[PDB]
Structure formats: C-alpha cells, structure tokens
Amino acid sequence: PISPIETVPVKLKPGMDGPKVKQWPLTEEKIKALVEICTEMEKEGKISKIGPENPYNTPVFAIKKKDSTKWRKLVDFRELNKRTQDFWEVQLGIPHPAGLKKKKSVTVLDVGDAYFSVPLDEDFRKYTAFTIPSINNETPGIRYQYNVLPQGWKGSPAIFQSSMTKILEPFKKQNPDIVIYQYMDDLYVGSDLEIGQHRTKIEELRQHLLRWGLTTPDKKHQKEPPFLWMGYELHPDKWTVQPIVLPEKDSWTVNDIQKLVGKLNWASQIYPGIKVRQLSKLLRGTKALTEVIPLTEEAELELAENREILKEPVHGVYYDPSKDLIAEIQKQGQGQWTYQIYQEPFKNLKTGKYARMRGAHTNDVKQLTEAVQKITTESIVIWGKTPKFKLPIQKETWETWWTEYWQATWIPEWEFVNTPPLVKLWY
Amino acid sequence: PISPIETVPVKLKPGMDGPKVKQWPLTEEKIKALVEICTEMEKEGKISKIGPENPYNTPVFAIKKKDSTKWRKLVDFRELNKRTQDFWEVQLGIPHPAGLKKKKSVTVLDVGDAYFSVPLDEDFRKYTAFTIPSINNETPGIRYQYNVLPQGWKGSPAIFQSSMTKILEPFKKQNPDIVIYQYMDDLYVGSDLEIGQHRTKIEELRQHLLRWGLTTPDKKHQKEPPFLWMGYELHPDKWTVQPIVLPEKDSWTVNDIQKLVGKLNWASQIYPGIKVRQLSKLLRGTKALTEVIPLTEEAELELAENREILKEPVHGVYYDPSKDLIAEIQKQGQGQWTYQIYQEPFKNLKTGKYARMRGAHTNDVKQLTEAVQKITTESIVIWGKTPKFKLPIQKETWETWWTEYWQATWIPEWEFVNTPPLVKLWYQLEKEPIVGAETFYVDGAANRETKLGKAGYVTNKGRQKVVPLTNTTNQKTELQAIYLALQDSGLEVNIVTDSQYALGIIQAQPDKSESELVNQIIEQLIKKEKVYLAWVPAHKGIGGNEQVDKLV
Numbered sequence: 001p002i003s004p005i006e007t008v009p010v011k012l013k014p015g016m017d018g019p020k021v022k023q024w025p026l027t028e029e030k031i032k033a034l035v036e037i038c039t040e041m042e043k044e045g046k047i048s049k050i051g052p053e054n055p056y057n058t059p060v061f062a063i064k065k066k067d068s069t070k071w072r073k074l075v076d077f078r079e080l081n082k083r084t085q086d087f088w089e090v091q092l093g094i095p096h097p098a099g100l101k102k103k104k105s106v107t108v109l110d111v112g113d114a115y116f117s118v119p120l121d122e123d124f125r126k127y128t129a130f131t132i133p134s135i136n137n138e139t140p141g142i143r144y145q146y147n148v149l150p151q152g153w154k155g156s157p158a159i160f161q162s163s164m165t166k167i168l169e170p171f172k173k174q175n176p177d178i179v180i181y182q183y184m185d186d187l188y189v190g191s192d193l194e195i196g197q198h199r200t201k202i203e204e205l206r207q208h209l210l211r212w213g214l215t216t217p218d219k220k221h222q223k224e225p226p227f228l229w230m231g232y233e234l235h236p237d238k239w240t241v242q243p244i245v246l247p248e249k250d251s252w253t254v255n256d257i258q259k260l261v262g263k264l265n266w267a268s269q270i271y272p273g274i275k276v277r278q279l280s281k282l283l284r285g286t287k288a289l290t291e292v293i294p295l296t297e298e299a300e301l302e303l304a305e306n307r308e309i310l311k312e313p314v315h316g317v318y319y320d321p322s323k324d325l326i327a328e329i330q331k332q333g334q335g336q337w338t339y340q341i342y343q344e345p346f347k348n349l350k351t352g353k354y355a356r357m358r359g360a361h362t363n364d365v366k367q368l369t370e371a372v373q374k375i376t377t378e379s380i381v382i383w384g385k386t387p388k389f390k391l392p393i394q395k396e397t398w399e400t401w402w403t404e405y406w407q408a409t410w411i412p413e414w415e416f417v418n419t420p421p422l423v424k425l426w427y
Numbered sequence: 428p429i430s431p432i433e434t435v436p437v438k439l440k441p442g443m444d445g446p447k448v449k450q451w452p453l454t455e456e457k458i459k460a461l462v463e464i465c466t467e468m469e470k471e472g473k474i475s476k477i478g479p480e481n482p483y484n485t486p487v488f489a490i491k492k493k494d495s496t497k498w499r500k501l502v503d504f505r506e507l508n509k510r511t512q513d514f515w516e517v518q519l520g521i522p523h524p525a526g527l528k529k530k531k532s533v534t535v536l537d538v539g540d541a542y543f544s545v546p547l548d549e550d551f552r553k554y555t556a557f558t559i560p561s562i563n564n565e566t567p568g569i570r571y572q573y574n575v576l577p578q579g580w581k582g583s584p585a586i587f588q589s590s591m592t593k594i595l596e597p598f599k600k601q602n603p604d605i606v607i608y609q610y611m612d613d614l615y616v617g618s619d620l621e622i623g624q625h626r627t628k629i630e631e632l633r634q635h636l637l638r639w640g641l642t643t644p645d646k647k648h649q650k651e652p653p654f655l656w657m658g659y660e661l662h663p664d665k666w667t668v669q670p671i672v673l674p675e676k677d678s679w680t681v682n683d684i685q686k687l688v689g690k691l692n693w694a695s696q697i698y699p700g701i702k703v704r705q706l707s708k709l710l711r712g713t714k715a716l717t718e719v720i721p722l723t724e725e726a727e728l729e730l731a732e733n734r735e736i737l738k739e740p741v742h743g744v745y746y747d748p749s750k751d752l753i754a755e756i757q758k759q760g761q762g763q764w765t766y767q768i769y770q771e772p773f774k775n776l777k778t779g780k781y782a783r784m785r786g787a788h789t790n791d792v793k794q795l796t797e798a799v800q801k802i803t804t805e806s807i808v809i810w811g812k813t814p815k816f817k818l819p820i821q822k823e824t825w826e827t828w829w830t831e832y833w834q835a836t837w838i839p840e841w842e843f844v845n846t847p848p849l850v851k852l853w854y855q856l857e858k859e860p861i862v863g864a865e866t867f868y869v870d871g872a873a874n875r876e877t878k879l880g881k882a883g884y885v886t887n888k889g890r891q892k893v894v895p896l897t898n899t900t901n902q903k904t905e906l907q908a909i910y911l912a913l914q915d916s917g918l919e920v921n922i923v924t925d926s927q928y929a930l931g932i933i934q935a936q937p938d939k940s941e942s943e944l945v946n947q948i949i950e951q952l953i954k955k956e957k958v959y960l961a962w963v964p965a966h967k968g969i970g971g972n973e974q975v976d977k978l979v
C-alpha cells in the first residue's frame with residue numbers, strides 16, 4: 001500500500017548470524033518467471049536490489065499454486081526461520097487451538113497477501129536477501145532483499161498477528177463456534193455447520209476480510225464446475241484408522257504362518273503384550289513351505305488375543321511439545337503410500353496412507369510430494385506445527401523435482417532414507 | 428584513472444577494530460623504491476598521505492619476482508581481511524563451454540588495473556594504512572592509505588564486479604543484442620553481426636568503460652582466437668583442452684596418482700571413454716602423499732586404454748538454443764558408465780562419466796537411474812533445461828524395476844536404443860513359494876573372536892550339510908549358506924534364512940559386486956528356474972530353524 005507503519009524490531013537468536021544458503025540452479029523458464037515477478041515487486045516497492053556487502057542469502061523457487069496460467073515465487077525461509085521465528089515462537093508465539101482438529105470441516109484460506117503492507121525493520125532486511133540465478137554462470141545472480149514482511153518467513157504472521165485478531169474480531173463475535181487458526185500465510189477456519197452452510201460461512205468470512213482489512217483470499221472455482229473443481233475442505237474428525245491388520249484366512253500354510261510370525265513378532269516392539277511362542281512352535285519343524293497346516297486350537301488363542309490387542313491403541317504415547325514431529329513415508333505400490341508420525345521410535349501419534357491415482361498420472365515423485373503436503377497439513381491442524389520427513393527417495397532426484405508438484409506456501413524439513421526393510425509390512 | 432562510481436560501504440566484523448601491525452624495516456634501497464612507486468601512486472590518486480591520528484598499519488613489502496625491471500609493492504592484508512565483514516560470494520563457478528552460444532564475432536577485453544580504478548569506502552580507508560620505513564631506522568614515517576580497492580583486500584573482487592555490472596547496465600540495455608560474460612578483470616563480448624559493426628560496438632563498449640576509469644586493450648580488442656582459457660581451447664566453432672599430456676614413469680606415489688587422475692577426469696568433458704575406476708581404486712584408507720604406490724595390472728592397462736583415446740584429438744561443438752538437447756548413456760562395465768550430450772549425431776556438446784557408489788552391492792537399473800539423474804542436474808546448470816534421454820534399457824525392463832522398487836523414482840522421458848550391452852534383470856525372485864519345491868532351511872554362524880564359522884542347511888526331505896569355513900563372519904557365513912542351498916538344490920528351490928541382511932542383499936537384485944561370493948550367488952540365481960527366498964525371525968523366531976540354528 002502506502003501507509004508507513006512503525007516497525008516491530010527483530011533480532012535473530014543469541015549469537016546467531018544471518019542465513020547463507022546456496023541458491024539451487026533453476027530452469028531458464030523459471031528464471032524468466034521469477035525475474036518478472038521480482039521486476040514487479042521492486043516496482044511495487046515490496047523488494048529492492050542490494051550491493052555485495054550483503055553476505056546473506058536464502059533460496060528461491062518458482063511454482064504454480066492453483067495450477068494457474070502463471071507462477072508464484074516461493075522463497076524457502078527454512079533456515080532464516082530457525083534463526084529467528086524460533087524466538088518469534090516466543091517473543092510473539094502464536095497459540096494452537098487443540099479443538100480445530102475436532103471440527104467437521106476445516107477450510108484453508110491463503111492470507112499471505114496481507115503482509116505485503118507492513119514495512120520490515122530496516123536492520124533485519126539484510127537477512128531476507130535472495131538471489132535470482134543465471135544459466136551456465138554467465139551473469140551474476142540478480143540480488144534482492146525484502147522491505148516488507150516476507151511470506152515464507154514465520155516472523156511475518158507473528159508480526160501481523162495484531163492486525164489479524166483485530167480484523168477477525170467482529171466475526172468471532174457473530175460466529176463464535178468457528179475456530180480460526182493462523183499458521184503462516186494460511187488461515188484455518190473450522191466449523192460444524194452442514195457441508196454447504198459452512199462453505200457459505202466461509203465466503204461470508206472471506207468477504208469480511210476483503211471488506212474489512214482489504215486482506216484478499218482467493219476464489220477456488222469460478223462458479224464454474226468442470227468436473228475438476230475443489231476448494232480445499234478438510235474433515236478431521238474422520239481421521240483415525242488401524243491399518244495394521246493381520247490377514248483373515250481359512251487355510252494357512254508354513255509360508256503363511258511364517259510371514260505371520262514375522263509381522264506379528266515385530267509388532268511386539270510397538271504393542272506391549274503380544275508373545276507368540278505357541279503359535280510359532282507350530283513351525284519348529286522342517287516342514288515344506290507350500291505344505292498346508294491347520295492352526296492349532298491351543299495356539300489360536302494367541303491369533304485371537306493378538307487379533308484383539310490390535311484393536312485397542314498403545315499406552316505411554318503422549319505428545320511432547322518440546323520435541324519435533326517426525327514423519328516416515330513408505331512406497332506401498334500401485335499409487336499407495338503408508339505414513340507414520342512419531343516422536344520416539346515405535347510410539348506413533350498418527351498413521352495414515354495416501355493414494356490418489358494408481359496408474360494415470362502415476363509418478364512416484366508427484367505422489368510423494370502430494371503425500372508430503374497431506375501428512376503436513378494434517379499435523380499443522382492436529383498440533384499446529386510441521387514435521388520432518390524421512391523421505392524414501394534419492395536426495396538429488398527429490399531436490400530436482402519437488403518444486404514441480406508443490407503447491408504449499410510453507411516448506412517442511414526432510415532427509416533421505418536408507419530403506420524401509422520389514423517396515424513395509426505396515427499395509 | 429579513478430571512477431565516479433559510488434562506493435560499496437564496508438564494515439569490520441562486529442566489535443572488531445582495525446589492524447595494528449608495525450612494519451619491519453630492511454633494505455633501504457627498497458625503502459626508497461617503495462616511496463618511488465608510492466609517489467607516482469598517491470600522484471594518480473590510488474593512495475594518500477595521512478596525519479598521525481587514527482593510525483593502524485599493515486605490513487608493507489617491496490619485491491622483484493621477474494626479469495628485473497620494476498620493483499613492486501606488496502601489502503599482505505591478511506590481518507586486515509581477518510577483520511572485514513563477509514561479502515557476497517563471487518561467482519565461484521566457471522561458464523562451462525558446452526553451454527556457450529555459437530556466436531559470430533567474439534571479442535575479449537583485459538580491463539587494466541581493475542581494482543585500483545574503483546574507489547574505496549570513504550570511511551573504511553583508515554584501515555588501509557601502512558608506513559614505508561625510515562632511511563635510518565629513526566621513525567620519520569611515510570604515511571599513506573588507499574582510496575581504491577587495495578590490491579589484496581578481502582572485499583575487493585566483490586566490489587569490483589559489483590562496480591563492473593552497474594557500469595555495464597546502461598550499455599547492455601542501450602544494446603540488448605551484445606552478450607557479455609564477465610570474469611575477474613576480463614570481459615567476453617559476443618555478437619551476431621559483421622566484423623565491421625561488431626568491431627564498432629566494442630569501441631562503443633570500450634569507450635563507455637573508459638568514461639569510468641576502466642581502460643581496455645589499445646591494440647583494439649587484442650583477441651587470440653582460439654583462447655587458452657581456464658584450461659580450455661576455445662575456437663569460434665569448437666572447444667577442447669590442449670595441454671593434456673599424462674606422464675609415464677616407473678615409480679608412482681599417492682601424489683603422482685592424484686595429479687594423474689585429476690587430469691584424466693578433466694579430459695572426460697570431451698574424450699569419449701576415459702575410464703578411471705582402476706587408478707583411484709588404489710588410493711584407499713591410506714593417505715600418504717609421497718608413499719610409493721605400486722601401479723596395478725589394471726591400472727597399467729586402464730592408463731594404457733586412456734592413452735590410445737587421448738592420443739588422438741577430439742573437439743567440441745557449441746549450443747544451439749534452437750534444437751533439442753539429447754543425452755545418451757552407454758555402460759562400460761566394472762560399475763562404470765559414460766555418456767555424451769548432443770544436438771547433432773557427429774558433433775557433441777560435451778561428454779562425461781559416472782561411477783557407482785563406492786562400497787555397496789548395487790544394480791544396473793538403479794545406477795542407470797543414478798546416471799540419468801547426474802546428467803539432469805549438470806544439464807540444468809549448463810543449458811537451463813533437461814535433455815531427452817536415449818537409454819540402453821527397454822521401457823519394460825525399467826517400469827518393472829521401479830514398480831518393484833521400494834523407493835520413489837521419476838526418470839524423465841527417454842527412448843530405447845538397441846546398442847549393447849543391454850541393461851536388464853538377470854533374475855526375478857518368486858513372489859509366492861514353489862509347490863513341489865525342496866525347502867532348504869539355511870543358516871550360518873561364525874565365531875567372532877576366533878574368526879571361524881559354519882554354513883549349512885537342513886531340508887524337509889531330510890538332507891543335511893554342514894560345511895566349515897575360515898576367516899568368516901556372521902554375515903559371510905549367512906550368505907555362504909544360501910550359496911550352499913542353491914548349490915545342492917534342483918532347478919527349482921525354496922530357501923529360508925534367519926538373516927534380513929542376507930535376504931536384503933539378494934532381495935535387491937545386484938548383478939555385479941566386489942564380493943566374489945555374492946557373485947558366486949548371483950551367478951547361480953540366474954541358472955535357476957525359480958527361486959523363493961523368504962525370511963523368518965532369528966532366535967525366538969525359530970521355524971525350521973530349530974534344526975539349523977543348532978548344528979550350525
């Protein structure tokens with residue numbers, strides 16, 4: 001806009017220094033993109049060009065949010081975050097409503113565009129610096145630094161939190177049962193209204209924002225449903241399952257009781273009381289593998305009992321909010337992916353399984369990235385904080401292609417993994 | 428002379444104050460020699476006499492490294508740098524030729540006295556203080572400080588290029604055609620016009636720069652086509668590296684080998700075939716710079732294989748943004764792959780190799796993928812895009828491995844090439860056991876301390892066997908075992924192991940390996956008609972193990 005607001009002074013952590021992260025190499029297509037986007041921002045004052053006395057740097061990517069005919073700039077403030085909002089997790093911490101996961105329909109609104117109005121503390125600016133790349137190293141990166149609260153930076157919501165709760169006030173007044181969590185550029189309006197009335201209450205809210213603080217969200221559909229139209233409605237209350245299910249069968253064999261003594265034996269690590277010596281003893285012999293054998297009646301009390309210790313959850317499993325959440329995903333096959341979200345080995349706080357298209361646009365990567373954004377968003381709703389993904393995939397391939405099907409404005413933390421061995425039998 | 432450019436303001440790391448290091452006098456003949464130069468310097472404005480207030484100091488030196496003519500000034504600024512704030516990394520990369528545009532006329536330009544031509548942050552000058560010594564060591568002191576980018580300071584190359592860019596901005600805009608790579612003191616101008624108008628633009632540029640203290644080659648763009656540049660032979664329609672001569676002795680040391688291999692890689696950009704598995708496969712666990720390293724048989728042959736290649740000359744072609752980038756890969760053998768990128772079947776934009784991970788049992792498919800990956804990255808850095816791949820693998824052999832493979836993988840678009848060897852699966856394991864198949868409950872176990880072991884089995888059909896082994900390990904034995912099951916089993920077999928490790932290895936499908944044994948095994952899986960390996964828990968879990976775990 002054109003309104004000089006005072007500037008919330010920002011300080012990084014104790015004896016911490018700005019981020020100096022390498023800017024990954026992009027496609028000419030994407031350079032060209034960013035180039036224009038920035039050429040514009042500079043034109044709107046949102047950003048500025050720097051000199052070489054700015055040692056700092058944070059990576060930038062180009063993506064398409066709503067598939068749209070045009071791109072979005074996605075700055076990866078992941079490092080600058082740890083070096084700041086982690087004291088803008090305190091100095092300005094945003095509290096997480098433990099009941100939003102409880103609503104029936106959580107819709108998500110993009111508000112990151114409010115920020116662009118608040119000028120950024122001059123002394124901090126030097127840290128928001130990013131660099132638009134060159135191809136084959138001809139010219140030197142184009143250098144920019146922010147003059148307004150940036151987007152991927154968690155210091156932005158934090159600072160805005162004031163203007164926000166204000167705007168959202170003569171609305172939580174009216175609608176008091178709706179819960180509204182703000183996590184970065186995303187608003188998370190949750191309700192219990194009937195699918196459609198809710199969808200209405202949203203547009204209601206959405207129009208309020210626009211009416212009130214000029215804060216603009218977005219229109220999903222153009223009121224035109226091409227059989228391929230959404231809006232982003234989440235339904236948390238229906239988020240539980242117990243995928244771990246011993247097989248159900250009439251006739252068993254050595255191979256079958258065996259593969260079973262395995263998965264079962266291995267569950268012991270995660271489920272307190274389940275021994276299986278009387279069921280497994282039925283194997284102590286060197287019988288053929290195809291050989292069919294009936295399940296001892298005596299032992300079957302274990303299959304029975306265990307079949308049941310696999311209906312009722314674990315115990316000493318609580319949420320440590322000092323610890324960070326870890327999400328392990330496994331390639332399942334035919335477009336299906338299993339995932340656990342834990343904190344301490346074998347004490348999961350949730351388990352799911354994405355899948356969206358078996359063999360059409362079936363591309364390991366695209367799937368993985370979409371599953372990553374799902375697992376994320378869920379947790380952002382359940383615990384108000386994103387996990388760190390142990391991703392089953394080659395570091396470089398991932399680094400090359402994630403930006404391809406990514407549509408989130410935030411980015412989590414990840415690391416690549418050795419191999420899910422006997423852990424695949426979690427289907 | 429000095430430019431009207433504004434100055435990049437510099438600061439010293441937090442809390443640090445300028446450097447104070449007094450000058451060690453000596454060689455009074457030099458002592459005047461400095462003042463001699465320094466004078467024609469302050470004259471030109473590069474420095475200035477300073478009142479004894481606010482002084483600091485850095486070591487002043489005078490030397491003559493050449494065919495004697497001019498004594499030269501030297502100001503080791505280390506302790507100064509040590510105190511100067513960090514800057515923006517200067518392009519610590521080099522425009523790779525493979526991605527340069529076949530241009531019509533190309534001119535290079537040696538900006539003279541670069542650093543000196545650009546001023547220095549008014550309030551950071553103090554710290555550039557020094558002092559030429561006394562005639563007699565009684566300190567009359569000749570005080571000076573820099574008003575330009577001091578020859579060896581930290582923040583110099585940065586701010587130089589910083590200034591170079593700004594300066595070139597209007598021009599690169601007043602004439603959008605002309606391309607200009609800038610590197611250090613050099614300027615590489617490229618254009619698609621006639622030597623007449625190209626030569627005329629230079630002058631424009633050349634004179635535009637001079638309006639900002641930047642002087643250029645007076646012999647009107649002194650260009651030496653082709654240019655020996657950063658280890659590259661740059662012609663206006665081909666590129667290479669000339670000084671590629673690899674030495675032959677009869678006594679090689681860790682050091683000599685290093686140098687050799689390095690050179691051998693560099694060659695790779697363009698010489699189809701350079702292999703290197705053998706020579707580097709020598710430098711291990713031992714990092715003794717000057718230690719006598721006995722050349723190996725393969726090293727000698729590989730070194731020989733490279734010579735015949737290198738012996739002959741091979742050129743490179745530039746990039747046509749108009750066509751499509753094609754990259755093709757061929758598999759050498761000992762875990763080696765080579766490839767080359769093109770747009771024309773005889774031409775080549777660049778070439779290169781890829782070597783397997785250094786330590787694991789791998790796979791020709793995974794590798795082929797690891798390769799396709801490498802190139803995709805390289806390709807992005809150089810040209811701006813990805814290339815179409817021509818791979819020695821059938822869409823069916825691939826889609827089968829990724830659909831089996833526990834890990835995500837997205838290989839861009841490729842087409843099949845029938846040029847062998849052909850990547851493939853040398854054996855698939857049965858998903859469900861074999862009815863009518865013999866069941867071998869294999870097992871191993873070695874004495875860790877005594878280094879002795881045992882590998883054996885016990886079949887359903889009553890057949891047993893316990894073979895002794897020496898210098899083995901829990902794992903060695905646990906494969907030693909399977910190998911046994913496959914050795915005594917009929918064309919169809921079911922094997923049961925208590926070791927995820929042994930399983931896992933095989934389960935991977937390695938076709939080659941640095942493990943005589945695993946090869947002993949791979950070779951036998953292939954001969955089999957149908958193999959079913961399955962895993963059962965170790966000690967508590969004791970299926971048919973009650974029999975194996977014991978004896979063995």
Ligand SMILES: CCc1c(C)[nH]c(=O)c(I)c1Oc1cccc(/C=C/C#N)c1
Nearest residue numbers: 527528530533535615616617654656662
């Ligand atoms: C002649 C090669 C060339 C090509 C193919 N295309 C260009 O646009 C330019 I400028 C080039 O000149 C260059 C490129 C890289 C370095 C130099 C400087 C040479 C030296 N010393 C000149």
Ligand SMILES: [Mn+2]
Nearest residue numbers: 870871872925
């Ligand atoms: Mn064993």
